[PDB]
Amino acid sequence: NLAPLPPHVPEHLVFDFDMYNPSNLSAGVQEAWAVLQESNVPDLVWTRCNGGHWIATRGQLIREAYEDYRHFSSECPFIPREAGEAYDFIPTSMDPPEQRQFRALANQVVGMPVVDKLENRIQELACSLIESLRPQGQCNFTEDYAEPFPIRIFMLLAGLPEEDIPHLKYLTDQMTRPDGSMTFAEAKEALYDYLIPIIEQRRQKPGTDAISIVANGQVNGRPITSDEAKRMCGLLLVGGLNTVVNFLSFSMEFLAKSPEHRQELIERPERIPAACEELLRRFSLVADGRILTSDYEFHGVQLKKGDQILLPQMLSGLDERENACPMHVDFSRQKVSHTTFGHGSHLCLGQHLARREIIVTLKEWLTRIPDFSIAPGAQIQHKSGIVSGVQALPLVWDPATTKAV
Ligand code: HEM
Ligand SMILES: CC1(C)[C@@H]2CC[C@@]1(C)C(=O)C2
Ligand SMILES: [K+]
CATH superfamily of 1-405: Cytochrome P450 (1.10.630.10)
Contact status, residue 357 vs residue 80, Cβ threshold 8 Å: no
Counted residue by residue, the chain has a size of: 405
State how beta strands 308-311 and 288-292 pair. antiparallel
**Cα angle for residues 94, 164, 20 (degrees, 5° grid):** 55
State how beta strands 218-219 and 72-73 pair. unpaired
Distance CA 324, CA 178 (A): 34
Resolution in A: 1.9
Residue type, 392: A
Contact status, residue 75 vs residue 305, Cβ threshold 8 Å: no
Please state the domain extents for the chain.
Answer: 1-405
Residue 375 DSSP one-character state: P
3-state secondary structure of 39: coil
Atom of ligand 2 nearest to the CA of 243: 3
Contact status, residue 13 vs residue 309, Cβ threshold 8 Å: no
Distance CA 118, CA 95 (A): 31
Cα atoms in the Cβ-side hemisphere of radius 13 Å centred on 365: 25
Of 296, 345, 288, 289, the C-alpha closest to 71 is 296
Distance CA 50, CA 110 (A): 33
**Nearest-CA residue for atom 18 of ligand 1:** 348
How far is the CA of 184 from the CAs of 55, 120, 180, 287, in angstroms? 21, 36, 10, 16
**Nearest-CA residue for atom 20 of ligand 1:** 348
Residues in Cβ contact with 75 at an 8 Å cutoff, skipping those fewer than 6 apart:
93, 94, 95, 291
Residue 146 DSSP one-character state: I
How far is the CA of 187 from the CAs of 81, 134, 150, 173, 199, in angstroms? 15, 37, 21, 9, 18
Distance CA 155, CA 148 (A): 10
Which strands make up the sheet holding 138-140, listed edge to edge?
A: 138-140, 394-396, 373-374
Contact status, residue 282 vs residue 247, Cβ threshold 8 Å: no
**84 ligand 2 Cβ < 6 A:** no
Query: Beta strands of 165-274 (E only): which ranges?
Result: 218-219, 222-223
Question: If residue 395 lies in a helix (H) or strand (E), which one and from where to where?
Answer: strand 394-396
CA of 355 to the centre of ligand 1 (A): 12
Q: Which residues does residue 289 pair with via DSSP β-bridges, in sequence order?
A: 310
**Nearest-CA residue for atom 10 of ligand 2:** 235
Of 16, 36, 23, the C-alpha closest to 316 is 36
Distance CA 240, CA 357 (A): 12
Angle subtended by helix axes 244-256 and 351-368, to nearest 10: 30
Contact status, residue 202 vs residue 216, Cβ threshold 8 Å: yes
Largest interatomic CA distance in the chain: 66
CA of 396 to the centre of ligand 1 (A): 32
Residues in Cβ contact with 145 at an 8 Å cutoff, skipping those fewer than 6 apart:
129, 130, 133, 139, 248, 252, 361
DSSP 61-117: HHHHHHH-TTTEETTS-SSSHHHHHH---TTTT--TTTHHHHHHHHHHHHSHHHHHH
Cis peptide before 148 (omega within 30 of 0): no
Distance CA 50, CA 342 (A): 23
3-state secondary structure of 13: helix
Distance CA 342, CA 77 (A): 13
Query: Phi, psi at residue 42, to the nearest 5°?
Result: -55, 165
Structure obtained using: X-ray
**350 ligand 1 Cβ < 6 A:** yes
**239 ligand 1 Cβ < 6 A:** yes
**99 ligand 1 Cβ < 6 A:** yes
CA of 345 to the centre of ligand 2 (A): 14
Of 286, 403, 272, the C-alpha closest to 332 is 272
Of 13, 21, 93, 136, the C-alpha closest to 381 is 21
Contact status, residue 209 vs residue 158, Cβ threshold 8 Å: yes
